[PDB]
Design a protein around this ligand. Structure first.
Ligand code: KUC
Ligand code: KUC
Length: 440
């Protein structure tokens, strides 16, 4: 076992009393009078991770050797406490007094569960002194210089009467595994290394190998096949997004017809995000991580950005490997047709419709075309897109209506899927060209 938490600190003098500022008091009042208490742990772990990253980047910028960089949790049932300590960059006295800002999120989270909070911090800057910070959540906090403070930050939470469950090792273990499994620094609970995983969505896409995606896909999809498609989407405008999307190699089953995990800086928000993607993209598996995450205007914005990017991805795949894309459309194309029918906005219907592939009177049997490719072949004076739904190519070609049209070179899409009729009825037009069935 490997533990660093113990009572090493002492205070030689008296404490200085300070009064919280008005809005901090008002938010402390809200917390006292107001739930999902367990999330204080994931917030504290996240701040510890940020403090460690700050130290690491600073030391690597210099030529300095790296110390042990770890996050530790300790429970004490006999004393009703939970403690977190990390060996990161710590806080100066100025910061401990210069108190939403991530110092604040860990703050209100802690007082959700605490009768009082006891903090020791020492900045990694050379010559830094250690400090004790104390508060019971009233309008006052106390600060005093402390000896025996390890570089970094230790937070001791003296738990409320109704929050003693967080002094149980097993309860805390389960909370850590639920929300904090992908934390990027070593994490220990009561001296035992927690088994945590690698957040590969945060890596630059060019550095993630196929075997890593295969392992991660099988984990997030709880699957045994490989992904037929992988999209690692990283952007910083207009939104922060680090995401990986997978399409299964297997065809969709009934389970897929009846999704994705949501994170924020490697902190789980929802294991199964409800509306992160449009419903028609529910066959996608994977992860979405956004620093911008508190239904909301933001979730709507994120969903629309991801929809556009995934449609672009599939368009680009049809260009990279048309035979592979044709199989994907055969296997997953009912989701696209569903999305066209259920979509409200004409622009969204036409975006999804860019993924449709059909046979054509102008192409060899078996060969597929897109609507935009059909449009590029339209002859001057003919301004509509013509189609015919039939069980197979032979029956379409021997339609008396198609036979007559053949005399004037008009291309006709041949559509064999039973839901093509409804899809094209609902699509109605594409790139300002009406869709017309050549038989009524
Ligand atoms: O959540 C934290 C917290 C937890 C772990 C930490 O390592 C730190 C820290 O020193 N940095 C240093 C950082 C430097 C950069 C950065 F990005 C994050 C950092 C976290 C802060 N709280 C909550 C508090 C509530 C009251 C008093 C406190 F002391 C509190 C500390
Ligand atoms: O009057 C007609 C009607 C009559 C003759 C037709 O050839 C068509 C047709 O399919 N065309 C006519 C064409 C003319 C030119 C062409 F290129 C293709 C054509 C296909 C429709 N209908 C058809 C109905 C179906 C359901 C309900 C109704 F009330 C309907 C009334």
């Amino acid at each position: 076992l490997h533990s660093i938490i113990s009572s090493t600190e002492s205070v030689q003098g008296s404490t200085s009393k300070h009064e919280f500022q008005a809005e901090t008091k008002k938010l402390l009042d809200i917390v006292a009078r107001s739930s999902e208490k367990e999330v204080f742990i994931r917030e504290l772990i996240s701040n510890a991770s940020d403090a460690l990253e700050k130290l690491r980047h600073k030391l690597v910028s210099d030529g300095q050797a790296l110390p042990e960089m770890e996050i530790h949790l300790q429970t004490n049932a006999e004393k009703g406490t939970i403690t977190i300590q990390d060996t990161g960059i710590g806080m100066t006295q100025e910061e401990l007094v210069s108190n939403i800002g991530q110092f604040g999120v860990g703050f209100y989270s802690a007082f959700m569960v605490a009768d009082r909070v006891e903090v020791y911090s020492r900045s990694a800057a050379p010559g830094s002194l250690g400090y004790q910070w104390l508060s019971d959540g009233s309008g006052v906090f106390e600060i005093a210089e402390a000896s025996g403070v390890r570089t970094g930050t230790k937070i001791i939470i003296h738990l409320k009467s109704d929050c003693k469950e967080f002094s149980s090792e097993a309860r805390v273990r389960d909370v850590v595994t639920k929300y904090s499994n992908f934390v990027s620094f070593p994490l220990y609970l009561n001296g035992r290394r927690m088994n945590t995983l690698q957040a590969i969505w945060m890596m630059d896409p060019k550095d993630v190998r196929e075997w890593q995606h295969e392992e991660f896909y099988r984990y997030v999809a709880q699957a045994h096949d490989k992904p037929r498609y992988t999209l690692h989407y990283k952007t910083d405008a207009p939104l922060n997004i680090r995401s990986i999307f997978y399409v299964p190699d297997m065809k969709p089953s009934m389970f897929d017809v009846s999704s994705v995990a949501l994170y924020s800086r490697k902190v789980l928000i929802q294991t199964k995000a409800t509306d992160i993607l449009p419903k028609w993209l529910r066959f996608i598996r994977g992860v979405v991580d956004s620093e911008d995450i508190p239904e909301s205007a933001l979730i709507r914005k994120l969903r629309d950005v991801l929809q556009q990017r995934l449609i672009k991805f599939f368009i680009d795949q049809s260009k990279k490997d048309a035979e592979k894309y044709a199989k994907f459309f055969e296997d997953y194309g009912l989701f696209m047709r569903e999305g066209i029918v259920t979509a409200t906005e004409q622009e969204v219907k036409e975006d999804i419709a860019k993924l449709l592939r059909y046979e054509s009177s102008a192409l060899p049997s078996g060969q597929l075309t897109s609507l935009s490719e059909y449009a590029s072949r339209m002859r001057a004076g003919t301004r509509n897109i013509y189609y015919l739904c039939a069980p197979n190519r032979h029956l379409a070609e021997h339609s008396p209506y198609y036979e007559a049209m053949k005399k004037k070179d008009t291309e006709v899409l041949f559509c064999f899927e039973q839901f093509d009729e409804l899809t094209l009825l609902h699509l109605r037009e594409f790139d300002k060209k009406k869709l017309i069935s050549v038989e009524t």
